[PDB]
Amino acid sequence: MELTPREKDKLLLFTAALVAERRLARGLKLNYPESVALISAFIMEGARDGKSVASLMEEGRHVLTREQVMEGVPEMIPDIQVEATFPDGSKLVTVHNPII
């Protein structure tokens, strides 16, 4: 595979998201790290699918709602940022106020 450090680092984000995904499935209100991981992973997959940066900046604000996370969490996450390999290379996706 010849995994570079950055690819290995992203594997850490993917795994953190697996943790959150399963807890959300159980019906738990997600905490700070879980929320950040879940939304981040979603965007990375969007990039793998070939969606645009513009599309993801919007879609990422509809992954989790205020009722699916603990109190204070939405305010602890003014934005989420993550980069991924789009068909046209690495790009940065910034999702402002992802949780409403």
């Binding site: 950055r6 943790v19 879980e34 991981a37 603990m70 602890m76 989420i80 980069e83 940065l92």
Partner: protein, 566 residues
């Protein structure tokens, strides 16, 4: 020109009269003073103030600071104030107003070409924590502790060996030398404790002359009156501290016999509540004496629903006890008491207990000293309301009382307060930057001796340092020679004199301990209470002046499930 207080707060952080919630607790701090001149605040960025001829002057390096922390909200034992912090030559230069004297008024911290900038607006800055109950079971503890905001670690050990699992002792010259050499590789200031359990003074002097800054008396090695006396005599001679884990078994005597053996000499009592060790069931009465500097280890802090349940097995593994041996289990049980555990929280709130520590991997959590200290403060406010010393509608005094427990008091107790312990001029620049929402839980930046040593860092290949995944990674201050320059290895005056550093070829900065024998309970900042305390021998109830001291266990705590992934 005018600006609203809200826009101002958003731009430069809060000012005099503004309040800030500490993380997700009920504790609120209020800005007591602001050392700036409104309109002359320094800010860095494109088109901002810190630029040539403007907020940055023309002075040579010797006439300006190496680093400035702009618009920091300082929280320390002496005050909660808004100000700029200047760092020069790895030490705290000044707390005041930064800028360029050429065009700005009241500049006390000059910014020049040689000055780096750390933007602290909206952030809280504290001194690095100091943990004095470290079991050197593994080197990984240093990074775990640094990440939590602890910059100095005092303890003993040789690795994951039986003796170290149970006690904070680095036994003898050879091991002491090896660990001093290994210390250069760790990103925290370090001081070692030798094995103080012996009745031949020369066996102790050898260890001190080898490098230890203290001696640990532990019951597992025999905390008898003869051993205690021998250790205190050598301590008085060589100006080093003694830490005590007393005779839980009451084998050689009761608490009063131990107290008699100490004979009024200065001593630091570890886990004074008793769960972690000490005369059952009344070692806690030690906090009434003027020569005792009392600390708590962290698993019992604060009293919660699951506290008692988790303690039995933790106790057994730590001290190599056999659950099949009746006497081994009976003595484990005699250490865990809901009565003394519940009182311990109140005694901290009153300032009868002066320090908090971990007891790392030996009935204690290395990354939870700071966190658990604030949880106790929260629970006490919730249960007892405002302290008598409190003025105004804020928890400023309770905050100062509790922060002193893991900063200045541990430094005073071990004779290193001349180097670290607080944000004061001349002290080593060990500082921790916190976003208010993560205060006491996950810091934004950890500075060791003027250099950032660790901090949360996003994608290395990203266009900015913020993209995910963000996790704690070592920085330049933790690298090779830079690390040696930014950390201190504490030595006893004797070792320093005998040239131990040159002989072992220690590469880090060296500091010597002093003033260990003269410190007393009255010297503990905001925590000098000497209560008339008693413990009922049958019921274990703790009473101060006849009043029952107790509290309720928490079901849920702040600084817990909202921040951690596991």
């Amino acid at each position: 020109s005018n600006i609203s207080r809200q826009a101002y707060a958003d731009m430069f952080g809060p000012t005099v009269g503004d309040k800030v919630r500490l993380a997700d607790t009920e504790l609120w701090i209020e800005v007591e003073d602001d050392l700036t001149t409104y309109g002359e605040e320094v800010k860095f960025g494109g088109g901002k103030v810190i630029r040539d001829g403007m907020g940055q002057g023309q002075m040579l390096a010797a006439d300006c600071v190496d680093l400035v922390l702009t618009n920091a909200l300082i929280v320390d034992h002496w005050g909660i104030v808004k100000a700029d912090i200047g760092v020069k030559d790895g030490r705290i230069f000044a707390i005041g107003k930064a800028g360029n004297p050429d065009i700005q008024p009241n500049v006390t911290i000059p910014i020049g070409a040689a000055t780096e900038v750390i933007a602290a607006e909206g952030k809280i800055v504290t001194a690095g924590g100091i943990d004095t109950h470290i079991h050197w079971i593994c080197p990984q503890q240093a990074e775990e502790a640094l990440v939590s905001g602890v910059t100095t670690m005092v303890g003993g050990g040789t690795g994951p060996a039986a003796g170290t699992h149970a006690t904070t002792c680095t036994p003898g010259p050879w091991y002491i030398s090896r660990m001093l050499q290994a210390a250069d590789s760790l990103p925290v200031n370090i001081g070692l404790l030798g094995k103080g359990n012996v009745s031949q003074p020369d066996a102790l002097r050898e260890q001190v002359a080898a490098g230890v800054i203290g001696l640990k008396i532990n019951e597992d090695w025999g905390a008898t009156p003869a051993a205690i006396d021998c250790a205190l005599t050598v301590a008085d001679e060589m100006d080093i501290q003694v830490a005590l884990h007393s005779d839980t078994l009451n084998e050689s005597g009761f608490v009063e016999d131990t107290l008699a053996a100490i004979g009024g000499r200065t001593i630091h009592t570890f886990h004074t509540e008793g769960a972690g060790g000490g005369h059952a069931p009344d070692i806690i009465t030690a906090c009434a004496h003027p020569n005792i500097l009392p600390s708590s280890t962290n698993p019992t802090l604060p009293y919660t629903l699951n506290t008692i349940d988790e303690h039995l097995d933790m106790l057994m593994v730590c001290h190599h006890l056999d659950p099949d041996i009746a006497e081994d289990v009976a003595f484990a049980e005699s250490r865990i008491r809901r009565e003394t555990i519940a009182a311990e929280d109140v005694l901290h709130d009153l300032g009868a207990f002066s320090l908090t520590s971990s007891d790392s991997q030996a009935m204690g959590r290395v990354g939870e000293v700071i966190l658990r200290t604030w949880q106790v403060a929260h629970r006490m406010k919730v249960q007892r309301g405002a302290l008598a010393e409190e003025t105004g509608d804020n928890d400023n005094f309770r905050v100062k009382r509790y922060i002193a427990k893991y900063t200045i008091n541990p430094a005073l107790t071990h004779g290193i307060a001349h180097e670290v312990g607080s944000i004061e001029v001349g002290k080593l620049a060990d500082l921790v930057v916190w976003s208010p929402a993560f205060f006491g839980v996950k810091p934004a930046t950890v500075i060791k001796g003027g250099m950032i040593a660790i901090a949360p860092m996003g994608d290395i290949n990203a266009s900015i340092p913020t993209p995910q995944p963000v996790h704690y990674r070592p920085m330049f201050g933790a690298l090779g020679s830079a690390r040696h320059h930014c950390r201190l290895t504490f030595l006893s005056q004797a070792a320093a004199a005998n040239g131990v550093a040159e002989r072992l070829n220690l590469r880090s900065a060296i500091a010597v301990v002093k003033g260990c024998r003269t410190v007393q309970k009255a010297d503990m900042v905001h925590n000098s209470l000497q209560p008339n305390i008693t413990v009922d021998a049958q019921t274990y109830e703790v009473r101060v002046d006849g009043e029952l001291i107790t509290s309720e266990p928490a079901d849920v705590l702040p600084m817990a499930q909202r921040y951690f992934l596991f």
